[PDB]
Amino acid sequence: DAIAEKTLRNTVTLTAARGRGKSAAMGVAIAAAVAYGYSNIFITSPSPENLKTLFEFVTIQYIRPQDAHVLGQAELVVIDEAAAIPLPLVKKLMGPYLVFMASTISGYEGTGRSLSLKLIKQLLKEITLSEPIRYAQGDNVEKWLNTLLCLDATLPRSKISTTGCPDPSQCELLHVNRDTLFSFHPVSEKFL
């Protein structure tokens, strides 16, 4: 409910891993706002992405961003995985209305969280959803893939140790080979 001393119209950005319900969340707002009633909505996306869940959960109509550039009808715009969309095009569009920004992270074909921050900075009310709709948390299969795949993001904010977060000190340049991969000691799986 974006109403307040601050503007009510603003940009929301919900980010989460896959299977979190970002789309489903984005679908709710569609009807929840009623054509006549709460209001009418809109939706855009990059090379398609599954538009199917959001709308199925959904007035959803879809004009892709470029074609989207045409005229301004709606009160609340929703863009699925905007991080994928060009900064220039995306920014212009966000200006004419109020938006829900969705983006997948921490998975395959997601967007790097480092880039996500730079992207957010361009604006943002950001929110995150932690639990999967399809399975229960703690699903060992999912844990397995995350660990195998190295889904985990932590370094941008901070490292988990005494150090982490900004990396202070003099920067030193050095090269290392693949072999570092096997050894587990100093220069180990960890460095790579």
Place this chain on the structure above:
Amino acid sequence: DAIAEKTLRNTVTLTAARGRGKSAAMGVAIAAAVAYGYSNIFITSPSPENLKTLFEFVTIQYIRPQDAHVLGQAELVVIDEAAAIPLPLVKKLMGPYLVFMASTISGYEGTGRSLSLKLIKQLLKEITLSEPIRYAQGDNVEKWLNTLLCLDATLPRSKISTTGCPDPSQCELLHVNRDTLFSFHPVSEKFL
């Protein structure tokens, strides 16, 4: 009231001389259809034309035809002096909705009735308004200008005489000079 066994949605074309009230007529429908209620409307026009009366008589919003080509929101479209708009652009637009087509004729900067028929053929429910809002009919000033200016259209449908309407017979090619203008007899003011 376009509702019937035939489609309710169709194209209406009201044509008339200037000062007939075409715009005012077109304005009425705007509110008469209520956003929520009868319905929402729309309006387009060529190089502008006085948009002022229609809307003042009017939800009127205006996106020019080309920019208009963007998305389809409305139940009843109105285009002011469409004859002025390109056939290609105009036709495409008429397809997506229900429309009121207005056009000025029988005056300065009006559209020739001959062309108007060809234009109509491209479709049309056409209606005409005969009396001026601003003055009483029979205003001698208006009669004067019409006659001076040669506002009168009659030849396309038919000539007022035994002959008129289609021109049958073998076509004969001949030239005549301006001088025909003065003489009033055979080859007179009439031929020119």
